[PDB]
Amino acid sequence: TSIMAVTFKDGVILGADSRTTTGAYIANRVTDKLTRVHDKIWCCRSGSAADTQAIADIVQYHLELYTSQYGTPSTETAASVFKELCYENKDNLTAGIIVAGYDDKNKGEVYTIPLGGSVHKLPYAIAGSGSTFIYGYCDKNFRENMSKEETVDFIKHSLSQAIKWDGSSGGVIRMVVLTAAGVERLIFYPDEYEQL
Amino acid sequence: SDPSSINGGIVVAMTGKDCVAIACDLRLGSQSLGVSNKFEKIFHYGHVFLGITGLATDVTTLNEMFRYKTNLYKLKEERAIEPETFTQLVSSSLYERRFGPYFVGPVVAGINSKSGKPFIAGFDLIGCIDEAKDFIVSGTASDQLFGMCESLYEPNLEPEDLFETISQALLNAADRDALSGWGAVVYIIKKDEVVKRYLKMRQD
Amino acid sequence: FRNNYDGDTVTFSPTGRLFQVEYALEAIKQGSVTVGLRSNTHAVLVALKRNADELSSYQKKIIKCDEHMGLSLAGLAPDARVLSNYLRQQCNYSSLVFNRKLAVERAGHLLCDKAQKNTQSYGGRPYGVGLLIIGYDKSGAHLLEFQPSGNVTELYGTAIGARSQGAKTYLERTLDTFIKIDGNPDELIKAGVEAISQSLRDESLTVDNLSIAIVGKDTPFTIYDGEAVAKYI
Amino acid sequence: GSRRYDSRTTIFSPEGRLYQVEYALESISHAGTAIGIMASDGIVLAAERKVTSTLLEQDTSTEKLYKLNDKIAVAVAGLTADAEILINTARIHAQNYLKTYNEDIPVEILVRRLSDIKQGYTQHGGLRPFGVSFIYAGYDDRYGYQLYTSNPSGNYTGWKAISVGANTSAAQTLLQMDYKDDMKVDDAIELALKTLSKTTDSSALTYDRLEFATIRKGANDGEVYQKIFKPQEIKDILVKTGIT
Amino acid sequence: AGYDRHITIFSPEGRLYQVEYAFKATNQTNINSLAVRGKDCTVVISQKKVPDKLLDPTTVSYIFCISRTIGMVVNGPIPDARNAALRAKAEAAEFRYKYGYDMPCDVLAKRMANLSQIYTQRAYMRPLGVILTFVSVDEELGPSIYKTDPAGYYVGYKATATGPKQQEITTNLENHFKKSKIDHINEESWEKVVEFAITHMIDALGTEFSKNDLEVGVATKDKFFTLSAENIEERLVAIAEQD
Amino acid sequence: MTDRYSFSLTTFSPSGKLGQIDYALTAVKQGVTSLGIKATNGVVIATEKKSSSPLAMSETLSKVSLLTPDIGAVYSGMGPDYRVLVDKSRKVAHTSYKRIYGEYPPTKLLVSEVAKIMQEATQSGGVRPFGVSLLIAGHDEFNGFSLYQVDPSGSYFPWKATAIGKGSVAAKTFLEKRWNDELELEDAIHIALLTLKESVEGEFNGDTIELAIIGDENPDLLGYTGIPTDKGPRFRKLTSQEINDRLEAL
Amino acid sequence: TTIVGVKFNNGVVIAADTRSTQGPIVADKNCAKLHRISPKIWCAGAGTAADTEAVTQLIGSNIELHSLYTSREPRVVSALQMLKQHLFKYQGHIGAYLIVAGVDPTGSHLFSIHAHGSTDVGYYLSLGSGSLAAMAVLESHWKQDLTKEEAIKLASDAIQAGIWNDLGSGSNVDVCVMEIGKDAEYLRNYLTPNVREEKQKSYKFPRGTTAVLKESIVNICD
Amino acid sequence: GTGYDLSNSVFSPDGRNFQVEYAVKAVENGTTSIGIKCNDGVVFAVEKLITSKLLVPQKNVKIQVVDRHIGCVYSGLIPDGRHLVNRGREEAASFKKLYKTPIPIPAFADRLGQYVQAHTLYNSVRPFGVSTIFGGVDKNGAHLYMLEPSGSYWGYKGAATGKGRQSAKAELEKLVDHHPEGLSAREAVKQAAKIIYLAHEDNKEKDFELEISWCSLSETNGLHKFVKGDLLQEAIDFAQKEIN
């Protein structure tokens, strides 16, 4: 699995590969690892499909009840709920989650929640088995306040490299753009990113 | 080690023309040591017959349980439970202990009193129902039984013929299993009557 | 009226009173007088012990919570034991978990909350005892008055029990005087005895009838009875 | 608080009586009369259905005679619904006993148990007692045919012939008048019908207002047989006994 | 004996006085409300009265946003209304979690009616002195209005009204539908339906409304929202230019 | 908090009466009349949809409910009590029977379960009896067609025909006259419609009346095909139209 | 085991083989791996027989009760949420691997659930030991916009890939078609390509061949 | 009949709950306290009757903080007030722990509301004997609230409760009218000290001690703090001056 979230000038974009495996067998080649826990708060799932799905469904339930009572939640709040679940249940979960959301006052934000259950707010974040192969690339090519086009390109190149080296990653690259303008879904096929 | 190989034993059931048959061996041992040669594995509640192979203590417990349940059933329903219904009761009862099962291999046989249709069924230790039209096998010599049945069997046999068939299937399978044998009993069931015969077999 | 609203604490009267609580307060008045006063270095508790017969003892009215805290009681002894024991634990939890002595003001808060729970729920009864708590903490000497209603107040001096109003007036008068008895415990204790005698009438404070407690700057809360208090009679 | 609305169902009267038990009994006394008569070759249970109609389906009806075991049965007088709760637990205690000892439960053991349940609602729990009285008719290989009775108090006793429900005093006097130790099941049947026939609060005594049952050990067998009479069967026995 | 009027047990006449008295409580706020169904929206109008000058007018409401799609207006004391709201929100959130789709207006109504039916049968729970009107544009039933009471009763309406002067509003609305012969305001925009609603709210009550005398909630496909003082004014003006 | 009402709210009076059950029956008496008639090949249960306002949608309120594909219920008394009883009845039919024997319970047993729930609300601590009387009709392979009545006490009995609620006495009488053991289902429906007419004050049509039957299997109401032993539910609610078509031959 | 699911232009279809095994022994030559959750929501199960049957009936039961309570047709996403949260609760110990499909007020659906509780969505799916033979066929013949008949063929051929090439799968082919506006149609043994050839001889024994020691009549009646 | 006022969750025939109304009497019998919302915060103040000279001055504090941004003051049964703050403090910790962000004042208000309303649902508990004024600064502004024993609460521009609630409410209504642009933190502090000195006349017999606290986005950084020393004295003066 290769997933990442990057904050740029207009907000934030989430990207992921679409492969779920059972050993060396690709159980699902068109997986959607970019999950919505709120209108403008999405997450990136890595690790156990069952664990992350269950976690995501719970956070969604929580934010929906939060909204019903106190209105739209901050991205920081969504990360707090994910963390609370991941940390308190560290012994029975295998979930690497990246939380990205778009706020009007805060623009775009990214919080990464790795295995332990610790929280980390960053300009951008990468996770999943394939992320190890692009640590160098991403660190060398990331700049703050990029444009949507620059960002989509950064995610597209980074992930195609991750997909190239990591056998657990593959299929199509999916993206989700979060800005004041709204929500946009992007999809890139093999024939495109494989030759970048 | 294997709760299903400590006591030993077999049960087999077949459907014939307007009849059904169910048989079992009589051995009850403790590993190599034979202990009893009168341990029957076939019981009945009303006109529904049930054979149980596996760990003897559970075979006994389950029988006591189904007597208990079919009794209350008759008192409330004001009628005798039918093969089909019982099968379901056995299945749900077994799954109730899904993670601490009874080490048994149940077999149901009987004639539906209303439709007069012959019926047989097998179950694994957690309740999975196997409703076959020809035969069901269970026990420590189930491979042998499968072999005997798959060859010897044929549809619509008459009571007298079905008897010869099921008896030969049981007898020859048991003689290839160290944990089975020591006597056998066969039940030929018909809408109206039920005959029980003890077979003559090797005692080693 | 009242008779239909004093059945239990969970019931409010038409005027907004809680009679059961008021009745509890009444147990205090029927209790033997006790006094409390402090300077800036010490805090003293002078308690008049009451005896049943002349063959009986003069029941203890002073309990120690910690090395820096203690209190005098007026009312139902069992309730004072329950409340004092609770305070001993809070004083103790503070030392064990935080290696910190519990602030007198904070102990008052705890008693108030414990008392309150017994005035809002069905089946229970309010506590029937008044308490005067003295202590020396990180902010000096302190004196507190506890009422079963849950009201706890910090004062320079005060008294509770029968005829307690005598002493209370005396103190409210002698204020400017004893508040300055710093560095001199015996003078504070004497002032404490002259206050408690302003509520006498029946007899006169005797040796086995008098009980005094002191705490302060360099004085771990300690209790004196009999002979040890002879030099104050 | 709640205390205010607590009836305190389990307290003693100044005379040392149990209010609720007393009133439950008063309740039972208005219930259709049930009679149990024990012979030498069997037992007879008869009961009068309280309140009936032209449209009441009697064929599928049961309100006073229930089978507990294959050797034990009961006649009910009181709240049917309350009775069913007890009957079901009763049927369970029987099966438990059977599964534990592999022997049918002795009649008294089953009766003592149920009576114990009732007695409980009498001493603790703050709940009302069961408005029910039972006549137990059963057989076991230790005491043969037995006849018992239990009421809201949780007390029970054995009889040769007895009644529960309405007009018990009247019915008891009549039984204590024509009963004889050497009776026969057919004699008992007739005595039972006569008693009800004389204590009814209705016009005549028709079959549509009766429930009948016998526990005999049919000579041509050697086992005990319970027979809950069918409407037609009760109508017949009604004619023969000269009540048409 | 006479306690058959303090807790919820039957009176000799087979009545439950506590339920009846709870109904009385529903009018304590002296406010009226009504709901009508559009072609593809549902509207709820409710009187807004702010007596104290020391109050923050923006926090005086009896309309609630139960879920992205369910809206609820309450007739009764605010503390009981908020208790009912919090619960309904919780119930709606959980339903989505467990069943994978949004709780339908009619279903949440039933759920709350059942909860109310319980305070009716259990002695330790008092009924809530409120009437709840739920509205939305159900994905299967379209514009929907369901109302529940302290008796645990609930039913769906073509249009409805609640409050002290409920009868006048009702008969007014009744007359309109006897006429139009349809069971809904045949309007494409919710703005006109809101206007229809306020108009009749005025006829039946014989009163004129300023932008701060009303409170309005609108339910449309996938969303329920409440109008602002200014959104309402824009509404009031429009109606003015017709009379 | 915490229900501290652990004592019975229904107790025995000196006369031997159980006040709360008596009062509950009184509540039932005020209820809208409902009835049931058993034919030789079916059963019919019917009641009046007493709309509590013309602005209310009478459809959204069904007094006749399906408990199992071969069993239905109807009542008289407190609708909310009936509603929660139907939910429990449907669930108990599963938890206590289908999930065990893999088949729906027979009418008498389900009725028995319901009766139990009601009996408990007669003795448990902190509750009042249910203020309803139900008429349950169903069919099962070994018992055929049946009709029962369950009262607030928890008592129940089988009927050839009966009525409960407001004008039960008059209705019961009219039924005794028209009932016989050779009635066909249509005949019973007809008699049901006639009986209910004497009880309805205002409009009498397929929109003010609610009627359902327990008859033949409806393979068309099954939703799928392929399993020979599944022929469809015997429970069927009549349509507003189906009712009117019959009211014309009234 | 081989179970598959295939969406077509106006519905969804699911198929499965009919073999059950214990080690290398065929326990059942014609079991039914197709379960009904509600009239129009069917499920294909693989893994532990008792488990697939049990979880399928439990959710089915609750779905029925939920339907009655809401006066609405059951939705596939609801069966999917109840099933998945149940399986998740049991950390994989309930060996149920399901392909759940169906039509409801919101349209036609196709999902899969693994024992641990994860779900997946697609136009075509397969699970079981035959899963790889089936998927090879699906990845080779599937196309968007299939007709009901094309779907039946595709799904049926996928199961056959399992029957022939996977030892864990065999015997017959079961299918169930769920179309948007019609009744769901269950086709038990839609294909039976493995009929046993006539035996070479009859083993009917001459009566009396079996030695009997004792005999008696059994009492059924009570 | 009557008795409708002896049990807490009971509805009187007129739909009221007398026990709650009685609790209110307890609130009216208490010290007066207020709340003044300003352009970027809120100010709290309360009257502290000096029963005697023995009371250590400035010690027995009454105003309470919840979390770090909320202030609470109340009139009525003091212990009941602490009980409510304790709950609020737990309520707040819980919220921050899961959502990270300190609790919004509106959210906090409902927490207290739901809890207080809860104590009017059972006869096993008593309604709260206090009216609480509380508020603070949050993500979107300042908020002032007053909660009644019935669980009722609304947002206010200014609020008062206790003995002299009328004097205060009067003074508060003036300020509201003569300052549509909104008072200031600094100004509200003096204004408050005044409303308190005026409302003290409804208790002019006993001497008192003033207490003020405030939470202003600019003066305290959104944190709740007590007014002490100079700023306090300056306010006492502004009051002592205009009291003549």
Ligand SMILES: *[B]([O])([O])[C]([C][C]([C])[C])[N]C(=O)[C]([C]C1=[C][C]=[C][C]=[C]1)[N]C(=O)C1=[C]N=[C][C]=N1
């Ligand atoms: B990715 O690696 O995170 C990937 C996708 C998932 C987060 C939606 N993980 C998986 O597919 C996991 C195994 C794994 C592989 C490499 C690194 C970490 C974890 N597989 C499954 O969860 C799975 C497989 N088959 C059925 C159900 N679930």
Ligand SMILES: *[B]([O])([O])[C]([C][C]([C])[C])[N]C(=O)[C]([C]C1=[C][C]=[C][C]=[C]1)[N]C(=O)C1=[C]N=[C][C]=N1
């Ligand atoms: B298939 O592979 O999924 C198949 C069909 C079943 C899910 C309906 N599986 C089985 O038949 C299983 C395999 C298995 C064996 C041992 C442990 C777990 C799974 N067999 C059985 O479930 C079974 C049931 N009864 C008797 C014998 N075997």
